[PDB]
Design an enzyme around this catalytic site. Structure first.
Site, PDB file in Angstrom:
ATOM      1  CD  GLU A 222     -13.367   8.481   3.114  1.00  0.00           C
ATOM      2  OE1 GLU A 222     -12.798   7.746   3.946  1.00  0.00           O
ATOM      3  OE2 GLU A 222     -13.219   8.358   1.878  1.00  0.00           O
TER       4      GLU A 222
ATOM      5  CG  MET B 138      -3.924  22.926  -8.719  1.00  0.00           C
ATOM      6  SD  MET B 138      -5.211  21.750  -9.119  1.00  0.00           S
ATOM      7  CE  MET B 138      -4.504  20.205  -8.507  1.00  0.00           C
TER       8      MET B 138
ATOM      9  CE  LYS C  64     -10.716   7.866  21.631  1.00  0.00           C
ATOM     10  NZ  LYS C  64     -10.505   6.419  21.876  1.00  0.00           N
TER      11      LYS C  64
ATOM     12  CG  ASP D 250      -1.817  16.119 -10.210  1.00  0.00           C
ATOM     13  OD1 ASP D 250      -1.147  16.263 -11.255  1.00  0.00           O
ATOM     14  OD2 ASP D 250      -2.309  15.010  -9.894  1.00  0.00           O
TER      15      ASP D 250
ATOM     16  NE  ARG E  83      -0.929  13.711 -12.060  1.00  0.00           N
ATOM     17  CZ  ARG E  83      -0.755  14.195 -13.289  1.00  0.00           C
ATOM     18  NH1 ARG E  83       0.394  14.021 -13.934  1.00  0.00           N
ATOM     19  NH2 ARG E  83      -1.742  14.850 -13.879  1.00  0.00           N
TER      20      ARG E  83
ATOM     21  CB  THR F 290     -12.562  15.209  20.365  1.00  0.00           C
ATOM     22  OG1 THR F 290     -13.852  15.187  19.735  1.00  0.00           O
ATOM     23  CG2 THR F 290     -11.491  15.067  19.283  1.00  0.00           C
TER      24      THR F 290
ATOM     25  CB  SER G  74     -11.255   7.116  30.046  1.00  0.00           C
ATOM     26  OG  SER G  74     -11.980   8.333  29.956  1.00  0.00           O
TER      27      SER G  74
ATOM     28  CB  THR H 272      -7.947 -10.975  11.440  1.00  0.00           C
ATOM     29  OG1 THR H 272      -7.902 -11.447  10.089  1.00  0.00           O
ATOM     30  CG2 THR H 272      -6.596 -11.222  12.078  1.00  0.00           C
TER      31      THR H 272
ATOM     32  CE1 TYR I 292     -16.668  11.799  12.814  1.00  0.00           C
ATOM     33  CE2 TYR I 292     -16.285  10.376  14.698  1.00  0.00           C
ATOM     34  CZ  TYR I 292     -16.745  11.568  14.176  1.00  0.00           C
ATOM     35  OH  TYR I 292     -17.294  12.523  15.003  1.00  0.00           O
TER      36      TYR I 292
ATOM     37  CG  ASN J  63      -5.053  -9.030   3.587  1.00  0.00           C
ATOM     38  OD1 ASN J  63      -5.565  -8.355   4.486  1.00  0.00           O
ATOM     39  ND2 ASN J  63      -3.879  -8.727   3.036  1.00  0.00           N
TER      40      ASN J  63
ATOM     41  CB  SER K  51      -2.196   5.206  21.561  1.00  0.00           C
ATOM     42  OG  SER K  51      -3.463   5.839  21.502  1.00  0.00           O
TER      43      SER K  51
ATOM     44  CG  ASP L 164       0.083 -14.789   7.020  1.00  0.00           C
ATOM     45  OD1 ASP L 164       0.457 -15.899   6.593  1.00  0.00           O
ATOM     46  OD2 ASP L 164       0.754 -13.754   6.854  1.00  0.00           O
TER      47      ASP L 164
ATOM     48  CG  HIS M  61     -13.373  22.617   9.514  1.00  0.00           C
ATOM     49  ND1 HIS M  61     -13.302  22.397  10.890  1.00  0.00           N
ATOM     50  CD2 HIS M  61     -13.814  21.455   8.980  1.00  0.00           C
ATOM     51  CE1 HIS M  61     -13.663  21.151  11.146  1.00  0.00           C
ATOM     52  NE2 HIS M  61     -13.953  20.545  10.010  1.00  0.00           N
ATOM     53  CG  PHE M  62     -11.668  20.164   4.940  1.00  0.00           C
ATOM     54  CD1 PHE M  62     -10.939  19.292   4.131  1.00  0.00           C
ATOM     55  CD2 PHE M  62     -12.364  21.206   4.334  1.00  0.00           C
ATOM     56  CE1 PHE M  62     -10.915  19.444   2.742  1.00  0.00           C
ATOM     57  CE2 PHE M  62     -12.346  21.368   2.941  1.00  0.00           C
ATOM     58  CZ  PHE M  62     -11.618  20.483   2.146  1.00  0.00           C
TER      59      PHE M  62
ATOM     60  CE1 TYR N 175      -3.157  -3.034   0.753  1.00  0.00           C
ATOM     61  CE2 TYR N 175      -4.541  -1.108   1.044  1.00  0.00           C
ATOM     62  CZ  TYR N 175      -4.406  -2.469   0.837  1.00  0.00           C
ATOM     63  OH  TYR N 175      -5.513  -3.273   0.711  1.00  0.00           O
TER      64      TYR N 175
ATOM     65  CB  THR O 169      -7.343  -0.330  -3.272  1.00  0.00           C
ATOM     66  OG1 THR O 169      -8.327  -0.714  -2.302  1.00  0.00           O
ATOM     67  CG2 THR O 169      -7.002   1.127  -3.087  1.00  0.00           C
TER      68      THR O 169
ATOM     69  CB  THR P 156      -9.938  -3.954   4.072  1.00  0.00           C
ATOM     70  OG1 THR P 156      -9.182  -4.145   2.868  1.00  0.00           O
ATOM     71  CG2 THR P 156      -8.982  -3.641   5.217  1.00  0.00           C
TER      72      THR P 156
HETATM   73  C1  HEO Z   1     -10.983  13.692   8.608  1.00  0.00           C
HETATM   74  C2  HEO Z   1     -10.970  15.019   8.775  1.00  0.00           C
HETATM   75  C3  HEO Z   1     -11.958  15.692   9.487  1.00  0.00           C
HETATM   76  C4  HEO Z   1     -12.161  15.676  10.822  1.00  0.00           C
HETATM   77  C5  HEO Z   1     -11.365  14.907  11.865  1.00  0.00           C
HETATM   78  C6  HEO Z   1     -13.274  16.569  11.086  1.00  0.00           C
HETATM   79  C7  HEO Z   1     -13.807  16.771  12.325  1.00  0.00           C
HETATM   80  C8  HEO Z   1     -14.890  17.559  12.584  1.00  0.00           C
HETATM   81  N1  HEO Z   1     -15.590  18.266  11.624  1.00  0.00           N
HETATM   82 FE1  HEO Z   1     -15.088  18.623   9.758  1.00  0.00          FE
HETATM   83  N2  HEO Z   1     -13.767  17.138   9.930  1.00  0.00           N
HETATM   84  C9  HEO Z   1     -12.952  16.586   8.944  1.00  0.00           C
HETATM   85  C10 HEO Z   1     -13.131  16.768   7.609  1.00  0.00           C
HETATM   86  C11 HEO Z   1     -14.132  17.510   7.081  1.00  0.00           C
HETATM   87  N3  HEO Z   1     -15.084  18.197   7.824  1.00  0.00           N
HETATM   88  C12 HEO Z   1     -15.895  18.719   6.839  1.00  0.00           C
HETATM   89  C13 HEO Z   1     -17.024  19.431   7.076  1.00  0.00           C
HETATM   90  C14 HEO Z   1     -17.502  19.715   8.323  1.00  0.00           C
HETATM   91  C15 HEO Z   1     -18.697  20.480   8.556  1.00  0.00           C
HETATM   92  C16 HEO Z   1     -19.577  21.138   7.495  1.00  0.00           C
HETATM   93  C17 HEO Z   1     -18.925  22.366   6.833  1.00  0.00           C
HETATM   94  C18 HEO Z   1     -19.273  22.505   5.356  1.00  0.00           C
HETATM   95  O1  HEO Z   1     -19.162  21.503   4.615  1.00  0.00           O
HETATM   96  O2  HEO Z   1     -19.647  23.620   4.928  1.00  0.00           O
HETATM   97  C19 HEO Z   1     -18.850  20.552   9.894  1.00  0.00           C
HETATM   98  C20 HEO Z   1     -19.916  21.315  10.655  1.00  0.00           C
HETATM   99  C21 HEO Z   1     -17.753  19.822  10.469  1.00  0.00           C
HETATM  100  C22 HEO Z   1     -17.606  19.609  11.799  1.00  0.00           C
HETATM  101  C23 HEO Z   1     -16.600  18.874  12.350  1.00  0.00           C
HETATM  102  C24 HEO Z   1     -16.497  18.599  13.763  1.00  0.00           C
HETATM  103  C25 HEO Z   1     -17.365  19.177  14.883  1.00  0.00           C
HETATM  104  C26 HEO Z   1     -15.450  17.776  13.890  1.00  0.00           C
HETATM  105  C27 HEO Z   1     -14.991  17.162  15.181  1.00  0.00           C
HETATM  106  O3  HEO Z   1     -14.437  15.855  14.960  1.00  0.00           O
HETATM  107  C28 HEO Z   1     -13.901  17.999  15.835  1.00  0.00           C
HETATM  108  C29 HEO Z   1     -13.318  17.295  17.051  1.00  0.00           C
HETATM  109  C30 HEO Z   1     -12.325  18.164  17.750  1.00  0.00           C
HETATM  110  C31 HEO Z   1     -12.687  19.042  18.738  1.00  0.00           C
HETATM  111  C32 HEO Z   1     -14.041  18.997  19.392  1.00  0.00           C
HETATM  112  C33 HEO Z   1     -11.740  20.091  19.215  1.00  0.00           C
HETATM  113  C34 HEO Z   1     -10.738  19.521  20.215  1.00  0.00           C
HETATM  114  C35 HEO Z   1     -11.091  20.040  21.576  1.00  0.00           C
HETATM  115  C36 HEO Z   1     -11.949  19.383  22.416  1.00  0.00           C
HETATM  116  C37 HEO Z   1     -12.589  18.096  22.022  1.00  0.00           C
HETATM  117  C38 HEO Z   1     -12.264  19.921  23.776  1.00  0.00           C
HETATM  118  C39 HEO Z   1     -13.763  20.103  23.947  1.00  0.00           C
HETATM  119  C40 HEO Z   1     -14.215  21.365  23.265  1.00  0.00           C
HETATM  120  C41 HEO Z   1     -15.424  21.926  23.533  1.00  0.00           C
HETATM  121  C42 HEO Z   1     -16.362  21.303  24.520  1.00  0.00           C
HETATM  122  C43 HEO Z   1     -15.857  23.186  22.861  1.00  0.00           C
HETATM  123  N4  HEO Z   1     -16.911  19.311   9.505  1.00  0.00           N
HETATM  124  C44 HEO Z   1     -15.416  18.431   5.519  1.00  0.00           C
HETATM  125  C45 HEO Z   1     -15.890  19.073   4.237  1.00  0.00           C
HETATM  126  C46 HEO Z   1     -16.595  18.169   3.282  1.00  0.00           C
HETATM  127  C47 HEO Z   1     -16.830  18.881   1.973  1.00  0.00           C
HETATM  128  O4  HEO Z   1     -15.850  19.060   1.216  1.00  0.00           O
HETATM  129  O5  HEO Z   1     -17.983  19.289   1.718  1.00  0.00           O
HETATM  130  C48 HEO Z   1     -14.340  17.659   5.662  1.00  0.00           C
HETATM  131  C49 HEO Z   1     -13.498  17.068   4.544  1.00  0.00           C
HETATM  132  C1  HEM Z   2      -0.545  20.720   2.034  1.00  0.00           C
HETATM  133  C2  HEM Z   2      -0.879  19.864   0.810  1.00  0.00           C
HETATM  134  C3  HEM Z   2      -2.176  20.323   0.207  1.00  0.00           C
HETATM  135  C4  HEM Z   2      -2.371  21.469  -0.471  1.00  0.00           C
HETATM  136  C5  HEM Z   2      -1.349  22.570  -0.718  1.00  0.00           C
HETATM  137  C6  HEM Z   2      -3.779  21.448  -0.879  1.00  0.00           C
HETATM  138  C7  HEM Z   2      -4.397  22.447  -1.601  1.00  0.00           C
HETATM  139  C8  HEM Z   2      -5.734  22.433  -1.989  1.00  0.00           C
HETATM  140  C9  HEM Z   2      -6.369  23.510  -2.716  1.00  0.00           C
HETATM  141  C10 HEM Z   2      -5.718  24.806  -3.143  1.00  0.00           C
HETATM  142  C11 HEM Z   2      -7.658  23.150  -2.920  1.00  0.00           C
HETATM  143  C12 HEM Z   2      -8.743  23.944  -3.680  1.00  0.00           C
HETATM  144  C13 HEM Z   2      -9.545  24.963  -2.819  1.00  0.00           C
HETATM  145  C14 HEM Z   2     -10.553  25.792  -3.619  1.00  0.00           C
HETATM  146  O1  HEM Z   2     -10.131  26.546  -4.529  1.00  0.00           O
HETATM  147  O2  HEM Z   2     -11.763  25.693  -3.335  1.00  0.00           O
HETATM  148  C15 HEM Z   2      -7.809  21.855  -2.300  1.00  0.00           C
HETATM  149  C16 HEM Z   2      -8.988  21.164  -2.266  1.00  0.00           C
HETATM  150  C17 HEM Z   2      -9.170  19.949  -1.645  1.00  0.00           C
HETATM  151  N1  HEM Z   2      -8.186  19.267  -0.949  1.00  0.00           N
HETATM  152 FE1  HEM Z   2      -6.333  19.779  -0.702  1.00  0.00          FE
HETATM  153  N2  HEM Z   2      -4.428  20.290  -0.441  1.00  0.00           N
HETATM  154  C18 HEM Z   2      -3.425  19.592   0.234  1.00  0.00           C
HETATM  155  C19 HEM Z   2      -3.602  18.384   0.870  1.00  0.00           C
HETATM  156  C20 HEM Z   2      -4.805  17.696   0.924  1.00  0.00           C
HETATM  157  C21 HEM Z   2      -4.966  16.443   1.619  1.00  0.00           C
HETATM  158  C22 HEM Z   2      -3.892  15.707   2.403  1.00  0.00           C
HETATM  159  C23 HEM Z   2      -6.254  16.074   1.472  1.00  0.00           C
HETATM  160  C24 HEM Z   2      -6.851  14.973   2.086  1.00  0.00           C
HETATM  161  C25 HEM Z   2      -7.319  13.901   1.431  1.00  0.00           C
HETATM  162  C26 HEM Z   2      -6.891  17.124   0.661  1.00  0.00           C
HETATM  163  C27 HEM Z   2      -8.212  17.129   0.258  1.00  0.00           C
HETATM  164  C28 HEM Z   2      -8.818  18.130  -0.498  1.00  0.00           C
HETATM  165  C29 HEM Z   2     -10.205  18.103  -0.920  1.00  0.00           C
HETATM  166  C30 HEM Z   2     -11.219  17.017  -0.626  1.00  0.00           C
HETATM  167  C31 HEM Z   2     -10.421  19.225  -1.643  1.00  0.00           C
HETATM  168  C32 HEM Z   2     -11.686  19.584  -2.432  1.00  0.00           C
HETATM  169  C33 HEM Z   2     -11.710  18.898  -3.815  1.00  0.00           C
HETATM  170  C34 HEM Z   2     -12.765  19.452  -4.748  1.00  0.00           C
HETATM  171  O3  HEM Z   2     -12.725  20.663  -5.035  1.00  0.00           O
HETATM  172  O4  HEM Z   2     -13.630  18.675  -5.200  1.00  0.00           O
HETATM  173  N3  HEM Z   2      -5.993  18.125   0.337  1.00  0.00           N
HETATM  174  N4  HEM Z   2      -6.627  21.415  -1.726  1.00  0.00           N
END
Ligand code: HEO
Ligand code: HEM
Ligand SMILES: [Cu+2]
Lengths: 501, 257, 185
Positions: A235, A28, A311, A24, A20, A308, A264, A160, A237, A91, A248, A84, A368-369, A10, A98, A153
């Protein structure tokens, strides 16, 4: 055909592919620095859309996806005490499938007619692409083949673990990287199928002229959105739950202290696995959600912090009593406990309905993400890669550059994504190709600058490793790390006798 | 060059934008302390600061330590959610005084056409309206779905084909503005920007319609309608001095049967 | 002496793939329904969904009266094949009406399909009309397998496995009609 070697199998794919994807994106991401058309030399969005969208399409399903399906593939066995993995021949295909999706991806790209509908690819944009439209088609195919694969998987490994650990070991003695492996693994089972159905539904739409989502005859969009997004949250998660494990051990070992709050954390892993199939509407809010249905899906996700905190705080206590080391591995471990909790708030914020109405699909979202992904997931992959690099290659990691690649990796992240947050408040529209407001045109420069660093680093590490295989300080010990690292695998030779162990 | 929420020129924005800051200042109680515990460690708990690595298991009030407080956050920063989660929301909410105009969005291919029910004109890429007043938004789609959003007004919502989107708004200061599209990307999804001309009073607003009334072009039919919706990115701020009595319904219908 | 019945729970979990599929799918239909029957609507008479059901119902017990006289009860070689046969027959039949109907639903409709209520439905079964194709072919294949190889008491893994796969299928079919056909209509 041996789980262990497939494991590496993998990682390879991933690495060769990030060469790649990055490329890419690294490319851009430029366009937003300078104004006008720029050195890019691209006609209307055609390509921009494709590219920047194909990106995220990849990183989620083909280069960062391998992580969990790769790691658990090479380390869950040797530490529970097995030989294994349950379904041998299977497996193997769990990967080889993929793989198919791989070459299958550059099939839509090998003709320049690759989709541009969002890494998810919404309706009104997908099916309407003329009869000759074979574009999204390739997209809907690559994820199907690849779909089934990872679907096994989670099954395979599930068995397993539920029937082949070490004799005498009670499910409670199960190692961290294993407990989490289960959780996330079961997930691929009770959740991944969702997509398959959905993906098929489209299939007929564009191939048979059915109207699963055409509101001009009977179909509806408010259906397709629910499924993809229902299974989507998960996905995010399955791609981080496992890391909890890897995290850990890398922590505990070097700090020289057991993982605190055992029970806990135990249920945490459990809890976190439940409250996931009911919170997907936080991707819906704008698309007209019932003020009351807002909460049932907005409030639920708001509690998910508590799990969260567990942990994190629990790892902290694992540090409180001292004697921690800060080598390559323990260094990433750091970042995690930092960056991850950084972007965390962002999710706790967007949690509330209105809090996002202005930020949704705005740069803030992107900020945010990528946070929780790059500095939260991509760290894992690397972080672990160290801790186990010997246990699979026969050699340890160059602590020199390892401390080097790190900084460039922590630093640049921020100079490439913290700026994006700003652009969000001023309300920047995602995936745009053409903007004008001088303000955005500024932060963009910083952002497009934060990378120049991150970019170069992806080279240093990748070049260092080479230097680590060919050139090496051939370790002939059984455990290069202190007695802290205590899991059945270690006691084994590195590498393992070809017939495992 | 900005790092805070939009210019405070709307009632809603307060109880919608303040939200973020307000809570962000009441969340920090954690991240700061989190960006505190993680930091301080590589410090004193180090090798040259701690002869060794003693060992223990629990106490169960270690969780408590960081137990009741998080959920305390997810309560304070929870109760708010529920309550705050309203205003802009659809459904029906009545509130009139025989003044609130009712626009109807017809975001076609890379342009933003509009329908004035009790006026008689038409627009493209620009919708003006008085100050301190209700802006009734009727939205849907002719092509692919999209987003109706005004940043400095924190007003976003979708626009799915074959359906009516409900949203209202209150501007509390003159000046023009701009509106962006939806998460979708493609040829022109990055050019679909319009303004929000908010003049001093409605006296000058009555004239905005006037000027258009003069426009030597009208949107009297569906045949002509598909003409203004034909493939054309970045449409210049155009107009129309006439709009079929029921154009809105004219759209949904065709895309519902 | 433990790995024997491993592919079982290692398949019983496998149903969680074809068990949720049939649930989200239903959800789609369960949506693509309240759209109000607007004009064109194809009705079904309560005869086929009784002969289709019955057939597929005898299998629920074409293995209940079999499993035993298959191995559990003191095996009797052949006494575990002629029955499978009968069983395969009902499978080929159940799939038959599943085709006679469709034809009839495209003999009138000269090609062009319309509405979703003749869409989702038009597919809901399809699946249930494919699952019972391979799950009906793997059966007969292993049939020729059980010949030369020939399985016996305790040693029967697959035929007691399949007797769980299929036994699940009919269950999914003790709804299809008892939800779509009767209720819907
Ligand atoms: C794998 C990566 C990943 C992870 C781990 C998370 C974790 C979280 N995400 Fe994010 N997300 C991720 C990836 C994405 N989220 C998205 C979108 C998204 C959206 C919608 C936004 C939008 O699409 O316009 C929301 C509201 C959240 C919420 C959260 C929350 C509450 C968590 C929680 O898991 C956060 C947990 C951490 C915390 C909580 C902070 C740590 C502190 C703590 C725990 C102490 C306690 C704090 C308090 C009591 C205040 N996520 C999208 C966009 C999808 C798209 O492109 O449309 C992606 C890709
Ligand atoms: C630091 C390396 C990375 C850079 C510089 C980068 C940069 C970007 C940029 C510039 C965009 C487009 C934003 C916009 O114009 O709306 C984007 C979108 C995105 N990136 Fe990344 N990215 C990185 C790593 C990652 C990784 C590790 C993931 C996780 C899988 C990821 C997932 C995404 C997704 C899902 C989108 C939206 C795709 C879409 O438009 O359909 N990126 N990234
Ligand atoms: Cu989510």
């Amino acid at each position: 055909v041996d789980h262990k070697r497939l494991g590496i199998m993998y990682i390879i794919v991933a690495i060769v592919m990030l060469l790649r994807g990055f490329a890419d994106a690294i490319m851009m991401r430029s366009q937003q620095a300078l104004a006008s058309a720029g050195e890019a030399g691209f006609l209307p969005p055609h390509h921009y859309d494709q590219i920047f969208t194909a990106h995220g399409v990849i990183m989620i399903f083909f280069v960062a996806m391998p992580f969990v399906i790769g790691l658990m593939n090479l380390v869950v066995p040797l530490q529970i005490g097995a030989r294994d993995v349950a379904f041998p021949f299977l497996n193997n295909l769990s990967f080889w499938f993929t793989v198919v999706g791989v070459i299958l991806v550059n099939v839509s790209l090998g003709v320049g007619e690759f989709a541009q509908t969002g890494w998810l690819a919404y309706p009104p944009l997908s099916g309407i692409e003329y009869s000759p439209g074979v574009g999204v088609d390739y997209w809907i195919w690559s994820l199907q083949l690849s779909g089934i694969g990872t679907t096994l998987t989670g099954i395979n490994f599930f068995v397993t673990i539920l029937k082949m650990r070490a004799p005498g070991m009670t499910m409670f003695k199960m190692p961290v990287f294993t407990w989490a492996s289960l959780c996330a693994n079961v997930l691929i089972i009770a959740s991944f199928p969702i997509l398959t159905v959905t993906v098929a539904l489209l299939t007929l739409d564009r191939y048979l002229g059915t109207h699963f989502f055409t509101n001009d005859m009977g179909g509806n969009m408010m259906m397709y959105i629910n499924l993809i997004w229902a299974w989507g949250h998960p996905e995010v998660y399955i791609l981080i739950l496992p890391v909890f494990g890897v995290f850990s051990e890398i922590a505990a070992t070097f700090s020289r202290k057991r993982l605190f709050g055992y029970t806990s954390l135990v249920w945490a892993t459990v809890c976190i696995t439940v409250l996931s199939f009911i919170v997907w509407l936080h991707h819906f809010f704008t698309m007209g959600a019932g003020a009351n249905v807002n909460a049932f899906f907005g409030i639920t996700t708001m509690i998910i912090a508590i799990p969260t905190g567990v942990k994190i705080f629990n790892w902290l206590f694992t540090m409180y009593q001292g004697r921690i080391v800060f080598h390559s591995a323990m260094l990433w471990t750091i970042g995690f406990i930092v960056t991850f909790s950084v972007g965390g708030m962002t999710g706790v914020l967007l949690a509330v309905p209105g809090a996002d109405f202005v930020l949704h699909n705005s740069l803030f979202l992107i900020a945010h993400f990528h946070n929780v992904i790059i500095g939260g997931v991509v760290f894992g992959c690397f972080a672990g890669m160290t801790y186990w690099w010997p246990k699979a290659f026969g050699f340890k990691l160059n602590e020199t550059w390892g401390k080097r690649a790190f900084w460039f990796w922590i630093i640049g992240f921020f100079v490439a994504f913290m700026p994006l947050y700003a652009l969000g408040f001023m309300g920047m529209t995602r995936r745009l190709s053409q903007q004008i407001d001088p303000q955005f045109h500024t932060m963009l420069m910083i952002a497009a600058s934060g990378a120049v660093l991150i970019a170069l680093g992806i080279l240093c590490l990748v070049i260092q490793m080479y230097v680590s295989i060919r050139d090496r300080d051939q370790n002939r010990d059984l455990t290069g790390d202190p007695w802290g690292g205590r899991t059945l695998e270690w006691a084994t030779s590195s590498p393992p006798p070809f017939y495992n162990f | 060059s900005a790092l805070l929420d939009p210019k405070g020129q709307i009632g809603l924005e307060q109880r919608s934008l303040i939200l973020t800051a307000f809570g962000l200042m009441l969340i920090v109680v954690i991240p700061a302390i989190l960006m505190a515990v993680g930091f301080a460690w590589k410090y004193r708990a180090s090798n040259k600061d701690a002869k060794y690595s003693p060992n223990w298991s629990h106490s169960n009030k270690v969780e408590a330590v960081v137990w009741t407080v998080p959920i305390l956050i997810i309560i304070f920063l929870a109760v708010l959610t529920w309550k705050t989660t309203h205003a802009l929301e659809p459904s029906k909410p009545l509130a009139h005084d025989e003044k609130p105009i009712t626009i109807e969005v017809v975001s076609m291919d890379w342009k933003w056409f509009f329908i004035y029910p009790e006026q008689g004109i038409a627009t493209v890429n620009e919708i003006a309206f008085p100050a301190n007043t209700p802006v009734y938004f009727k939205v849907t789609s002719n092509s692919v779905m999209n987003s109706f959003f005004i940043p400095r007004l924190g007003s976003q919502i979708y626009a799915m084909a074959g359906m009516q989107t409900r949203l209202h708004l209150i501007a509390n200061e003159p000046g023009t503005y701009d509106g962006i599209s939806a998460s979708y990307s493609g040829p022109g999804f990055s050019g679909m920007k319009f303004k929000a001309i908010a003049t001093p009073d409605r006296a000058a607003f009555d004239q905005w319609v006037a000027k258009a009334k003069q426009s030597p072009n009208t949107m009297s039919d569906m045949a002509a309608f598909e003409k203004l919706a034909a493939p054309s990115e970045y449409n210049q701020v155009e107009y129309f001095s006439n709009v079929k009595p029921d154009l809105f319904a004219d759209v949904i219908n065709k895309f519902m049967a | 002496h433990d790995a024997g019945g491993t592919k079982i729970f290692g398949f019983w979990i496998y149903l969680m793939s074809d068990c949720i599929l049939f649930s989200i799918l239903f959800a789609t239909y369960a949506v693509l329904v309240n759209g109000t029957a607007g004009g064109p609507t194809g009705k079904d008479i309560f005869e086929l969904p009784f002969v289709l059901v019955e057939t597929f119902l005898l299998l629920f017990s074409s293995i209940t009266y079999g499993m035993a006289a298959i191995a559990m009860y003191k095996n009797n070689k052949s006494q575990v094949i002629s029955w499978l046969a009968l069983t395969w027959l009902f499978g080929a039949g159940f799939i038959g009406m599943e085709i006679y109907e469709f034809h009839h639903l495209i003999v009138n409709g000269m090609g062009p399909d319309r509405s979703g209520f003749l869409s989702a439905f038009f597919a809901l079964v399809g699946t249930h009309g494919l699952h019972v194709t391979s799950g009906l072919i793997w059966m007969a294949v292993l049939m020729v397998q059980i010949a030369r190889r020939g399985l016996t008491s305790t040693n029967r893994t697959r035929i007691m496995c399949l007797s769980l796969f299929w036994h699940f299928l009919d269950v999914v079919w003790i709804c299809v009609f008892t939800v779509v056909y009767l209720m819907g209509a």
